[PDB]
Ligand binder design. Structure first.
Ligand SMILES: O=C(N[C@@H]1CCN(c2ccccn2)C1)c1nc(C2CC2)ccc1Nc1cncnc1
Ligand SMILES: [Mg+2]
Ligand SMILES: [Zn+2]
Length: 313
């Protein structure tokens, strides 16, 4: 109860900003995450003995892959923290609780491969879940860690409060399947443009929480350029691994995943910002106007990729 986590001044101040980078020191991330649960939720939401043991089980079930790692888990949890703070009153007490856990858990036990490479490889997880293959695996993995003796952070919730929170988490986690982002955003654009959009409509919140999860999941494009540029290296380390695996199944992989086609990266970043990132954050600022900074940073990084092509860095 009477324990606070207190970060250093620079972190204390930088963490409130959308663009915050959680730094290269693995052994502070668990504390940065608690810091965010207490400031976002209450020093009450969870018992610190339970939360810590949940965090270190979650850390342990991420894998040492180039991008879909523990670092990303917590990066994506901080973007949700930033969204939750600058929209204090739009979100229920349960939703703040669920969504930060959601974010921390959203890529649990990823192996560095797309839902696509699972199906072409005929991995068992592709027989168990026909679509959002990894994302259903990640939710399953979260339900599993919550059920370890001593790990149920949600134990001090009514039967009903409990079922709501695992259902927020479930949908949140499914929504980080980029294949369900496209339809979800078209609907939300249409719903705020035609004015029908209703945040008391539970099914409409669902869509809005889904957008946030794509926004938080993609939040690596919203960072300062050096951060975004060095994160891009890690993201293509996985994509190119996957490409090599595709090639060993005797399948020419898409250019995104072909390490021969490095030359095509800047133009591939271009389409990705235009086709996915700008629309994501555009729609998200339209619906939660204090999220504007993510659109402005994303815009800025687009311009930085425009400069790489023009042959100026
Ligand atoms: O970059 C992404 N996609 C584009 C799509 C065409 N493309 C090409 C195409 C040809 C050659 C080279 N690249 C690359 C991208 N994709 C995803 C999921 C969709 C899997 C998540 C993040 C991404 N970006 C990113 C992440 N973290 C920091 N910075 C950026
Ligand atoms: Mg994922
Ligand atoms: Zn992710």
């Amino acid at each position: 109860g009477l324990m606070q986590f207190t970060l250093p001044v620079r972190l204390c101040k930088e963490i409130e900003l959308f663009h915050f980078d959680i730094g290269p020191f693995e052994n502070m991330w668990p504390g940065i995450f608690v810091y965010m649960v207490h400031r976002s939720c209450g020093t009450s939401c969870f018992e610190l003995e339970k939360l810590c043991r949940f965090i270190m089980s979650v850390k342990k079930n991420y894998r040492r892959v180039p991008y879909h790692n523990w670092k990303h888990a917590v990066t994506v949890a901080h973007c949700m923290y930033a969204i939750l703070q600058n929209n204090h009153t739009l979100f229920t007490d349960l939703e703040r609780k669920g969504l930060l856990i959601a974010c921390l858990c959203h890529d649990l036990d990823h192996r560095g491969f797309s839902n696509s490479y699972l199906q072409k490889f005929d991995h068992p997880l592709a027989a168990l879940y026909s679509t959002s293959t990894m994302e259903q695996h990640h939710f399953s993995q979260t339900v599993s860690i919550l059920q370890l003796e001593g790990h149920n952070i949600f134990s001090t919730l009514s039967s009903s409060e409990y079922e709501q929170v695992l259902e927020i988490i479930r949908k949140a986690i499914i929504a980080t399947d980029l294949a369900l982002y496209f339809g979800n955003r078209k609907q939300l654009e249409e719903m705020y443009q035609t004015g029908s959009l209703n945040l008391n409509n539970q099914s409409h919140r669902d869509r809005v929480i889904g957008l946030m999860m794509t926004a938080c999941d993609l939040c690596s494009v919203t960072k300062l350029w050096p951060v975004t540029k060095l994160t891009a290296n890690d993201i293509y380390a996985e994509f190119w691994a996957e490409g090599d695996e595709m090639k060993k199944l005797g399948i020419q992989p898409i250019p995104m995943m072909d390490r021969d086609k490095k030359d095509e990266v800047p133009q591939g970043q271009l389409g990705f910002y235009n086709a996915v990132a700008i629309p994501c954050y555009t729609t998200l600022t339209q619906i939660l106007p204090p999220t504007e900074p993510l659109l402005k940073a994303c815009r800025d990084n687009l311009s930085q990729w425009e400069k790489v092509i023009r042959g100026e860095e």
